[PDB]
Amino acid sequence: GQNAQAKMIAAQTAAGRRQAMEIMRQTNIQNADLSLQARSKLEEASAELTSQNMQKVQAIGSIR
């Protein structure tokens, strides 16, 4: 059955192609999550640095 063999192999092309497409989908989606995590880290850094600024206002104020 040459046709049966061709059908089975065609399924392998389908298996590898969708498997590769999914590899890119999973890798691309994870990267987006990491970018969002980096953005959240930037926001947290901004908040803590603002707290440091506010403490500075009172600190340098007392020195003056």
Partner 1 sequence: NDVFFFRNRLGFLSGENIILSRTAKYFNFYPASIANLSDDDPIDVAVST
Positions in the binding site for partner 1 (CB under 8 A)? 53-55, 57-58, 61-62, 64
Task: Determine the Cα–Cα distance for residues 2 and 55; give it in Å rounded to an integer.
Answer: 79
Cβ at position 60, least distance to partner 1 in Å: 9
Measured from the CB atom, is 38 or 59 closer to partner 1? Answer: 59
Cβ at position 61, least distance to partner 1 in Å: 4
Cβ at position 59, least distance to partner 1 in Å: 9
Burial letters 32-63, b for 16+ CB under 10 A, else e: eeeeeeeeeeeeeeeeeeeeeeeeeeeeeeee
